[PDB]
Amino acid sequence: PSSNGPLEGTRGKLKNKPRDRGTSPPQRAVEEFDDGEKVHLKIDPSVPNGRFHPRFDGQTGTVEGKQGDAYKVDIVDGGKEKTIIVTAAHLRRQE
Amino acid sequence: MHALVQLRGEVNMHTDIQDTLEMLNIHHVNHCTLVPETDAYRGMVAKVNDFVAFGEPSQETLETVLATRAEPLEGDADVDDEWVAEHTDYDDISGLAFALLSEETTLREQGLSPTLRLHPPRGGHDGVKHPVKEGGQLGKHDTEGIDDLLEAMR
Amino acid sequence: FHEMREPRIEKVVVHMGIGHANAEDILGEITGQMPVRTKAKRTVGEFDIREGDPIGAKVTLRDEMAEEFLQTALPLAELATSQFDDTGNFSFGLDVTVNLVRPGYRVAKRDKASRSIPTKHRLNPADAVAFIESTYDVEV
Amino acid sequence: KPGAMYRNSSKPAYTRREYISGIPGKKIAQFDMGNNGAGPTYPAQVELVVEKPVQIRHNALEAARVAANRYVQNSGAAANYKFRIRKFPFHVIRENKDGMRAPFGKPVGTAARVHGANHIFIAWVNPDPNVEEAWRRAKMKVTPTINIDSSPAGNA
Amino acid sequence: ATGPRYKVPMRRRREARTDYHQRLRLLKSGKPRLVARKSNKHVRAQLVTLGPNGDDTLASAHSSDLAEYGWEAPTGNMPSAYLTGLLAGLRAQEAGVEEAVLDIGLNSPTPGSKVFAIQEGAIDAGLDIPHNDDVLADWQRTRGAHIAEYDEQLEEPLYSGDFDAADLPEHFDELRETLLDGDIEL
RNA sequence: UUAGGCGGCCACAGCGGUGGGGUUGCCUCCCGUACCCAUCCCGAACACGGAAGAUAAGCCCACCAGCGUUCCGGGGAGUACUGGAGUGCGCGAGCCUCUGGGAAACCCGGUUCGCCGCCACC
RNA sequence: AGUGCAAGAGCAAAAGAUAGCUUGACAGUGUUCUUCCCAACGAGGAACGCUGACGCGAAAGCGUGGUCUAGCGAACCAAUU
RNA sequence: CCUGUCAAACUCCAAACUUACAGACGCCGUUUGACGCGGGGAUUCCGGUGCGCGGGGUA
Ligand SMILES: [Cl-]
Ligand SMILES: [Cl-]
Ligand SMILES: [Mg+2]
Ligand SMILES: [Mg+2]
Ligand SMILES: [Mg+2]
Ligand SMILES: [Mg+2]
Ligand SMILES: [Mg+2]
Ligand SMILES: [Mg+2]
Ligand SMILES: [Mg+2]
Ligand code: NA
Ligand code: NA
Ligand code: NA
Ligand code: NA
Ligand code: NA
Ligand code: NA
CATH number at residue A79: 2.30.30.70
The answer for residues whose C-beta is within 8 angstroms of residue B133's C-beta and 6 or more apart is B139
What is d(CA D60, CA D54) in angstroms, rounded to the nearest whole number?
Answer: 12
What one-letter code names the amino acid at D137? R
CATH number, domain B1-57+114-154: 3.30.1390.20
Sheet of D106-114, strand order: D54-57, D106-114, D91-95
8 Å CB contact between D95 and D72: no
Task: Find and list the nucleotides of strand G having atoms within 7 Å of a protein beta carbon.
Answer: 8-15, 18-19, 30-40, 47-50, 57-64, 67-70
Give the count of beta carbons closer than 10 Å to the beta carbon of residue E161.
5
- Furthest-apart CA pair in chain C: how many Å? 54
Cross-strand pairs, B112: B72
Cross-strand pairs, D33: D83
Q: Please, is A24 exposed, middle or buried when counting C-beta atoms within 10 Å of its C-beta (0-12, 13-18, 19+)?
A: middle
What is d(CA C82, CA C125) in angstroms, rounded to the nearest whole number?
Answer: 9
Dihedral (CA of E69, E71, E76, E77) sign: negative
What is d(CA A61, CA A59) in angstroms, rounded to the nearest whole number?
Answer: 6
The answer for residues whose C-beta is within 8 angstroms of residue E19's C-beta and 6 or more apart is E105, E106
What is d(CA E77, CA E144) in angstroms, rounded to the nearest whole number?
Answer: 8
For the domain made up of D1-156, the CATH class stated in words is alpha beta
Distance of CA D110 to the CA centre of its chain: 12
Residue C55's nearest CA partner among C77, C34, C74, C35 is C35
Is C126 strand, coil or helix? helix
Does the CB of E1 have a partner CB in chain C at under 8 Å? no
Does the CB of A11 have a partner CB in chain E at under 8 Å? no
User: If you ran DSSP here, which 8-state letter would residue B35 be given?
Assistant: E
Output the distance from E79 CA to F17 C1' rounded to whole Å: 46
**DSSP alpha helices (H): ranges in chain D?**
58-69, 131-136
CATH number, domain C1-140: 3.30.1440.10
Is E128 strand, coil or helix? strand
Name chain A contacts of E20, Cβ cutoff 8 Å: 23, 25-26
A32 backbone dihedrals φ, ψ, rounded to 5°: -110, 120
**Which residue among E7, E20, E27 places its CB closest to the CB of A18?**
E7
Residue D85's nearest CA partner among D126, D116, D56 is D56
Residue A27: CB less than 7 A from any atom in strand G: no
What is d(CA C111, CA C88) in angstroms, rounded to the nearest whole number?
Answer: 24
Show which subunits contact C, needing at least 3 CB pairs below 8 angstroms: E
Give the count of beta carbons closer than 10 Å to the beta carbon of residue B52.
26
Distance of CA E141 to the CA centre of its chain: 15
What is d(CA C26, CA B131) in angstroms, rounded to the nearest whole number?
Answer: 101
Method: X-ray
Dihedral (CA of A39, A43, A49, A52) sign: positive
8 Å CB contact between C102 and C8: yes
8 Å CB contact between A91 and A31: yes
8 Å CB contact between E62 and E44: yes
Q: Do E106 and C115 touch (CB under 8 A)?
A: no
Name chain C contacts of E105, Cβ cutoff 8 Å: 112
Between the alpha carbon of residue A60 and those of residues A10, A37, D73, E125, E128, the distances in Å are 19, 10, 72, 46, 39
For residue A77, which nucleotide's C1' is closest to its Cα?
G38
The CA dihedral of E141, E143, E146, E147, to the nearest 10 degrees, is 150
Q: Which value in Å is the resolution of this experimental model?
A: 2.9
Task: Find and list the nucleotides of strand F having atoms within 7 Å of a protein beta carbon.
Answer: 4-11, 13-18, 25-30, 34-38, 40-59, 67-70, 83-88, 92-94, 97-100, 114-121
Give the count of beta carbons closer than 10 Å to the beta carbon of residue E52.
6
The answer for residues whose C-beta is within 8 angstroms of residue E88's C-beta and 6 or more apart is E34, E45, E46, E47, E59, E60, E61, E121, E122, E125
8 Å CB contact between B88 and B126: no
Name the architecture of domain B58-113.
Orthogonal Bundle (1.10)
Could you give the angle at which helices B143-152 and B59-69 cross, rounded to 10 degrees? 20
Is C49 strand, coil or helix? coil
Dihedral (CA of E93, E99, E105, E109) sign: positive
Residue B151's nearest CA partner among B68, B76, B83 is B68
8 Å CB contact between B76 and B70: no
Give C62→chain E minimum CA distance, Å. 23
What one-letter code names the amino acid at E4? P
Is E45 strand, coil or helix? strand
> How do the domains of chain D map onto residue ranges?
1-156
Beta strands in chain E (DSSP E): 33-38, 43-49, 56-62, 101-103
Q: Do E106 and C111 touch (CB under 8 A)?
A: yes
Name the architecture of domain E1-186.
2-Layer Sandwich (3.30)
Between the alpha carbon of residue E15 and those of residues A4, C66, C106, C109, E8, the distances in Å are 45, 33, 15, 14, 12
Does the CB of C113 have a partner CB in chain E at under 8 Å? yes
Q: Please, is A91 exposed, middle or buried when counting C-beta atoms within 10 Å of its C-beta (0-12, 13-18, 19+)?
A: buried
Half-sphere exposure of D109 (CA within 13 A, CB side): 19
Radius of gyration (C-alpha) of chain B in whole angstroms = 15
8 Å CB contact between B27 and B13: no
Does the CB of C33 have a partner CB in chain E at under 8 Å? no
What is d(CA A17, CA A95) in angstroms, rounded to the nearest whole number?
Answer: 24
What one-letter code names the amino acid at E13? R
Give the count of beta carbons closer than 10 Å to the beta carbon of residue B95.
15
| Backbone interruptions in chain D following residues (C to N > 2.5 Å) | 97
Provide the domain limits for residue A73: 1-95
What is d(CA A20, CA A41) in angstroms, rounded to the nearest whole number?
Answer: 18
Give the count of beta carbons closer than 10 Å to the beta carbon of residue B112.
23
**DSSP alpha helices (H): ranges in E16-144?**
20-28, 78-95, 114-124, 140-143
Residue B58's nearest CA partner among B15, B94, B86 is B94
Name chain E contacts of A29, Cβ cutoff 8 Å: 24
What is d(CA E90, CA E98) in angstroms, rounded to the nearest whole number?
Answer: 10
What is d(CA E101, CA E46) in angstroms, rounded to the nearest whole number?
Answer: 11
Is D38 strand, coil or helix? coil
User: If you ran DSSP here, which 8-state letter would residue A7 be given?
Assistant: T
Beta strands in chain C (DSSP E): 9-16, 36-37, 57-61, 90-92, 95-100
Could you give the angle at which helices E169-179 and E145-152 cross, rounded to 10 degrees? 160
